[PDB]
Amino acid sequence: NLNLFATILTYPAPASNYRGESEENRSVIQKILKDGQKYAIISPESMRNALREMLIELGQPNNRTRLHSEDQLAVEFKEYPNPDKFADDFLFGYMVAQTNDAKEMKKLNRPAKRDSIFRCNMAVAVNPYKYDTVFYQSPLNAGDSAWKNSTSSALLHREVTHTAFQYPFALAGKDCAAKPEWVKALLQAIAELNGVAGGHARAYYEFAPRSVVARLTPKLVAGYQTYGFDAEGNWLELSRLTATDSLPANEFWLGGELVRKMDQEQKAQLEAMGAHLYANPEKLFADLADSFLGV
Amino acid sequence: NLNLFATILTYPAPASNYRGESEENRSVIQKILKDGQKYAIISPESMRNALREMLIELGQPNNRTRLHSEDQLAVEFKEYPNPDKFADDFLFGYMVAQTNDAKEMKKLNRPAKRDSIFRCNMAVAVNPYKYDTVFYQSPLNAGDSAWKNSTSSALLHREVTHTAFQYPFALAGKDCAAKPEWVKALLQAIAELNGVAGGHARAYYEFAPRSVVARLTPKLVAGYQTYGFDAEGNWLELSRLTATDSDNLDLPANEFWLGGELVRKMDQEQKAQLEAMGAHLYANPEKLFADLADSFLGV
Amino acid sequence: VTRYLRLKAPFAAFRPFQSGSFRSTTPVPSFSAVYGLLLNLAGIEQRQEVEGKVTLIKPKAELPKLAIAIGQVKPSSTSLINQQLHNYWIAPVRREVLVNLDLIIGLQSPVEFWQKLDQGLKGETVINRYGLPFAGDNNFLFDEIYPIEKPDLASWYCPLEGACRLTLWIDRENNTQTTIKVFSPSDFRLEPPAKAWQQLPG
Numbered sequence: 001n002l003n004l005f006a007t008i009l010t011y012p013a014p015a016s017n018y019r020g021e022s023e024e025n026r027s028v029i030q031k032i033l034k035d036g037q038k039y040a041i042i043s044p045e046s047m048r049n050a051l052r053e054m055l056i057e058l059g060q061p062n063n064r065t066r067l068h069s070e071d072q073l074a075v076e077f078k079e080y081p082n083p084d085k086f087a088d089d090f091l092f093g094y095m096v097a098q099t100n101d102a103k104e105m106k107k108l109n110r111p112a113k114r115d116s117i118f119r120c121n122m123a124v125a126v127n128p129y130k131y132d133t134v135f136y137q138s139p140l141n142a143g144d145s146a147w148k149n150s151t152s153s154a155l156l157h158r159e160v161t162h163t164a165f166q167y168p169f170a171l172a173g174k175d176c177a178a179k180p181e182w183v184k185a186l187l188q189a190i191a192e193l194n195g196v197a198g199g200h201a202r203a204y205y206e207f208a209p210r211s212v213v214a215r216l217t218p219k220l221v222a223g224y225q226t227y228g229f230d231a232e233g234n235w236l237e238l239s240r241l242t243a244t245d246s247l248p249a250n251e252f253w254l255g256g257e258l259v260r261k262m263d264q265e266q267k268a269q270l271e272a273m274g275a276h277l278y279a280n281p282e283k284l285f286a287d288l289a290d291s292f293l294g295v
Numbered sequence: 296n297l298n299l300f301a302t303i304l305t306y307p308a309p310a311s312n313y314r315g316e317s318e319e320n321r322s323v324i325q326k327i328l329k330d331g332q333k334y335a336i337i338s339p340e341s342m343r344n345a346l347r348e349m350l351i352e353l354g355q356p357n358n359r360t361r362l363h364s365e366d367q368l369a370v371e372f373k374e375y376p377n378p379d380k381f382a383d384d385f386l387f388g389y390m391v392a393q394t395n396d397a398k399e400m401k402k403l404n405r406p407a408k409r410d411s412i413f414r415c416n417m418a419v420a421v422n423p424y425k426y427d428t429v430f431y432q433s434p435l436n437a438g439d440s441a442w443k444n445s446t447s448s449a450l451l452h453r454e455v456t457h458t459a460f461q462y463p464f465a466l467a468g469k470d471c472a473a474k475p476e477w478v479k480a481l482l483q484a485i486a487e488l489n490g491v492a493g494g495h496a497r498a499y500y501e502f503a504p505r506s507v508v509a510r511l512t513p514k515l516v517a518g519y520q521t522y523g524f525d526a527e528g529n530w531l532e533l534s535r536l537t538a539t540d541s542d543n544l545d546l547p548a549n550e551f552w553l554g555g556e557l558v559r560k561m562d563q564e565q566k567a568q569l570e571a572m573g574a575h576l577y578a579n580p581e582k583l584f585a586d587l588a589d590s591f592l593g594v
Numbered sequence: 595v596t597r598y599l600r601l602k603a604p605f606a607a608f609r610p611f612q613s614g615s616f617r618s619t620t621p622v623p624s625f626s627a628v629y630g631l632l633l634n635l636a637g638i639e640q641r642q643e644v645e646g647k648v649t650l651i652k653p654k655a656e657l658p659k660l661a662i663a664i665g666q667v668k669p670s671s672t673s674l675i676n677q678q679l680h681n682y683w684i685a686p687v688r689r690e691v692l693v694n695l696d697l698i699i700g701l702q703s704p705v706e707f708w709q710k711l712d713q714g715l716k717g718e719t720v721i722n723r724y725g726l727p728f729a730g731d732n733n734f735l736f737d738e739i740y741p742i743e744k745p746d747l748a749s750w751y752c753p754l755e756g757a758c759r760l761t762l763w764i765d766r767e768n769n770t771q772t773t774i775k776v777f778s779p780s781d782f783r784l785e786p787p788a789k790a791w792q793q794l795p796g
Binding site for chain 2: 146147149150153162202283
């Protein structure tokens with residue numbers, strides 16, 4: 001009743017969001033796993049930034065914003081952050097002060113802020129990387145030398161992968177005074193997010209809706225899930241070794257997109273046991289959030 | 296009413312699209328997908344260049360134009376690009392810089408344009424590649440040595456595939472002061488684009504009209520699509536259960552999708568049934584665009 | 595002695611102090627890291643970390659009667675992640691990530707620890723823990739429970755005269771000066787040797 005875990009995956013699409021650099025100038029995608037196969041990942045900071053952006057999208061106050069300015073990457077300080085900030089700072093955000101301003105911001109609020117509340121993890125492609133690549137760029141040269149760029153024009157490679165990746169997340173129920181209004185917006189945003197990449201002029205894909213399962217339990221952060229889905233998407237096997245033996249109990253699962261599989265007989269027996277009666281993932285977050293909340 | 300989505304496929308035809316290079320004298324094709332087979336693709340910047348060319352085709356001022364010069368691929372730059380440009384610079388493109396003159400050319404505009412208003416992804420052949428080739432060639436030699444080319448008369452190869460492919464795109468509604476005039480031209484050009492290939496003297500085909508699955512709702516970028524069709528070309532099988540129930544069951548709405556050419560499939564009774572909720576009425580995509588650009592727009 | 599609890603995570607990271615512009619990780623968590631983690635599981639106020647922003651001092655009369663034996667038997671590759679950090683405006687710097695870790699942690703304590711651990715499955719009026727042992731930073735913690743006791747044997751490494759440096763006592767103002775544990779590599783065995791266990795002041 002005070003903890004909520006979940007995992008989200010998406011639809012197949014090519015890849016993007018490179019980070020590394022090459023001496024010979026081929027953009028490279030991140031690699032982590034060393035067992036004879038490669039995988040592509042995304043750091044949590046990117047999706048945290050996207051969540052901040054869509055919190056900005058809905059009417060929500062904030063003390064942090066990204067400004068498009070000179071080449072140096074900077075963020076607007078704005079005014080002194082307060083824990084009673086309506087949308088962002090209360091939700092998360094850690095501030096560390098070298099001098100601690102003046103007398104601990106005049107003996108107000110708390111000096112160091114704990115993010116807590118929201119958690120995230122890696123995103124794993126759950127599909128091996130392949131050496132496929134495409135050489136694409138043939139830049140131009142000015143014919144009038146008006147703000148001319150580099151003199152030469154080169155030809156370099158870029159690679160994509162037809163892949164869909166998943167990620168887990170979690171949050172604990174601790175505050176209910178002002179939290180519910182912002183938690184509703186947070187769940188609405190996480191139910192539909194976009195971006196989490198740099199290159200969107202090319203390689204456009206969005207990863208909000210797919211088969212989602214969440215668990216609201218007072219387990220104090222213990223999860224039976226292995227945090228891994230099927231490559232084909234029929235990850236349901238972990239339920240079969242569990243659901244038939246209800247040792248998780250009857251009200252320890254939810255349902256998402258996978259429920260619209262044509263088979264129906266075991267859906268009926270699980271309907272009397274689990275409340276996975278939702279076929280639209282957007283509808284799922286509208287109701288189960290209320291159950292997680294005190295009211 | 297603030298976002299527009301679509302995925303567009305084409306007619307079946309052979310495609311050459313020679314992109315790669317090989318010492319073995321075979322212009323190879325790009326493969327990206329891994330399911331045990333190979334697929335042919337289209338780079339998005341190719342259709343970007345085609346869209347630029349047809350923005351040039353209709354009366355639309357621009358700053359970028361291609362010229363033929365020494366072998367270094369060069370493009371004429373004309374006036375310095377500005378965000379308040381008419382067709383090309385405002386709609387897409389970035390004003391990259393190395394020195395960026397002094398104080399941002401006396402505080403004129405800004406050297407950072409966010410991105411293209413509309414965003415597109417690469418195309419997928421949705422038909423397996425085959426190892427067929429054409430022995431299409433026999434270069435010859437000059438006779439009087441006047442402007443003679445390479446000395447020998449060598450042999451080489453080429454390959455083609457009989458394939459029809461689709462591609463998605465989307466955009467968001469932000470500006471409405473100057474945007475509508477050029478958005479109309481963009482939609483008209485999207486309704487009919489031609490090129491997106493190197494070889495049109497040989498292996499000519501056009502690929503704009505086959506079907507439209509357009510969508511416009513104030514959901515802030517939600518996609519129920521998978522951006523994939525079948526070989527026969529209809530994808531309504533999984534989405535027929537979704538199309539109905541406009542009133543209840545929290546299912547995607549009635550004025551949520553648009554029709555295309557697949558509506559002219561043989562049966563009509565269920566077409567009439569779906570007519571009651573959704574706007575699957577327009578058989579010709581070019582007419583569909585002229586109406587839904589107005590609907591999406593302010594007027 | 596009376597209970598050895600093992601736990602796994604999908605990934606982990608443990609970055610020694612004064613890393614600089616190259617953040618590295620050790621194959622195993624430090625003794626103080628797991629101590630703070632389990633203490634956190636139990637629930638306690640942030641004492642050792644005397645932060646420069648808030649006064650959270652450590653009273654001297656604390657005696658965690660804990661002796662632990664850890665080590666890594668399974669191999670875990672380390673990958674490099676390139677990212678950008680705002681902390682020195684923003685400058686880019688890359689660090690390391692551990693793919694996985696093993697499950698051999700053992701504990702001894704007076705009887706009061708077992709009540710909280712037993713109540714762990716069911717929680718009433720839970721209170722958050724300030725310390726975040728080993729690393730102040732959050733977003734990197736996952737936990738598991740296994741009371742399986744003896745089975746799933748693995749190596750135990752006894753410090754002798756491998757993880758060259760393990761931090762001891764979690765000093766903040768000045769270097770703790772505990773020095774390297776020097777556990778090195780421990781020969782395979784069902785039961786860890788008595789030299790593996792040791793007393794930690796805090």
